[PDB]
Every structure is written in structure tokens, then in C-alpha cells.
């Protein structure tokens, strides 16, 4: 029985590694490669539109990698199209917020953005300081718990595979997939003596919702702005 659970762990971690966007060692190595005060000023001089366009392009890209993640989770493609959409709609952005913590450097409070690391001030042109500060605090809180790759991979699978999502057709098919992931994650946390980390997670719902709202706002108003 153990070997199957350990196989499902390795299956979820494989699915995650292939869809991670960047390798973690790449993000950690690039931490030294930091934006200059001049390169910061370049980003601060851009238009609100141009800076939101870039960030929405990266959010959109990130959501497409989570769909590739879900597609490789055993049982998810067996679900009906409606359920796949309902789960990804309700889960995708929170998996992005969680995946983002890997590209956050707690030492200097800087994030990987378009080839180098910089601080909150890199995003002044979004005129959303409170939102920026919150996504930074969130990434800081997950960074400080030292979530391994395995933990992120299993946790983000459980953010997606949730049978409580309003609008599901095959609830029982989703519960079977969720339960198997809970077994697997529970076995992993026991082995590693990390049972208690999910008590210490900051809440992500409100932040994900705002990030989704901003992405939609830019789709809706594209014709008021250049191509």
C-alpha cells in the first residue's frame, strides 16, 4: 500500500517539476542578479497600462502552467469538461500565488521579475501599493516556512482537487481523487515530521480574487488601449 502512496507522491512531484515554469535552482542562483536603481526607475517611469499589461501577461502565462499541472494529475482528464473548468476557475490563481513564493528572496525582500530580482518599488506604476505589499507579505510568510518542492506540489494539487466547489457534476469522482491526495500528503508530512505546517499558512482567497479581477479588467478594456 505504502509504495502506491509513495508512487502518487512522485507522480504529483513529477507533474509539478515539468510544469514549475522555472527550476528552483535557477531562481535561487539568479538571486544575486539584482535590478539597479536606474533599471528600477525605468519600470517606475512606465504607464499604468504598460505595467499592468506585462503583469497580466505573466499572471495569464502562470495560470496556463497550472492547467498543464492539472492535466498531468491522475484522474483529472477523466473528469467531465465542466468539472475541470469549475476546479481550475476556483483554484488556479491561488496555486499561482503559492508557486510565486519560490521567486521571493526573504534576505533582501526582492522578487524575480523579467530576468533579475527587485523590491516592491519595481511595481510603483501599478498604483496598488496595498495589493503589492500583501502579495509580498504572503510570499514572505510561505518563504519563512521553507515549503519544499514536494510540499508545494502536493499542497497545490489539493488547492485544485476540491469536492466543495459549487457547480460540480461528479462530486464523488472529485472526492475519490482528493482523498487519495490527502492520504499521500498525510503520509509525506508524517515521514518528514511536518504535520503542523498547514496550521501556519496565511490565507490566499482574497489576494487571488483581486489578481483574477485585475486580469479580467485588462481583458474587458483592451480596446480602450493600444495592441
Amino acid at each position: 500500500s505504502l509504495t502506491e502512496i509513495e508512487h502518487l507522491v512522485q507522480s504529483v512531484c513529477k507533474s509539478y517539476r515539468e510544469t514549475c515554469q522555472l527550476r528552483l535552482e535557477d531562481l535561487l542562483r539568479q538571486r544575486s542578479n539584482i535590478f539597479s536603481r536606474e533599471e528600477v526607475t525605468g519600470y517606475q517611469r512606465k504607464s499604468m497600462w504598460e505595467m499592468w499589461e506585462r503583469c497580466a501577461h505573466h499572471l495569464t502565462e502562470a495560470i496556463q502552467y497550472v492547467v498543464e499541472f492539472a492535466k498531468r494529475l491522475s484522474g483529472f482528464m477523466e473528469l467531465c469538461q465542466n468539472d475541470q473548468i469549475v476546479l481550475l476557475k476556483a483554484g488556479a490563481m491561488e496555486v499561482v500565488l503559492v508557486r510565486m513564493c519560490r521567486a521571493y528572496n526573504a534576505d533582501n525582500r526582492t522578487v524575480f521579475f523579467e530576468g533579475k530580482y527587485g523590491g516592491m518599488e519595481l511595481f510603483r506604476a501599478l498604483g496598488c501599493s496595498e495589493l503589492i505589499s500583501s502579495i509580498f507579505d504572503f510570499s514572505h510568510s510561505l518563504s519563512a516556512l521553507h515549503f519544499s518542492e514536494d510540499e508545494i506540489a502536493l499542497y497545490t494539487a489539493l488547492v485544485l482537487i476540491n469536492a466543495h466547489r459549487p457547480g460540480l457534476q461528479e462530486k464523488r469522482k472529485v472526492e475519490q481523487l482528493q482523498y487519495n491526495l490527502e492520504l499521500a500528503f498525510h503520509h509525506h508530512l508524517c515521514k518528514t515530521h511536518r504535520q503542523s505546517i498547514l496550521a501556519k499558512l496565511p490565507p490566499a482567497g482574497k489576494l487571488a480574487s483581486l489578481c483574477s479581477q485585475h486580469v479580467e479588467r485588462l481583458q474587458i478594456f483592451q480596446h480602450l488601449h493600444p495592441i
Binding site: T60, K89, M93, V215, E216
Partner: peptide
């Protein structure tokens, strides 16, 4: 729910 994410997600499933 969000239509904008629905659109992104529908595209990526095909």
C-alpha cells in the same frame, strides 16, 4: 467565479 479566467482556462484545456 471569473469569466476572464474562464476564457484563459477554456483555451488552455483545448
Amino acid at each position: 467565479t471569473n469569466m476572464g479566467l474562464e476564457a484563459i482556462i477554456r483555451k488552455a484545456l483545448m
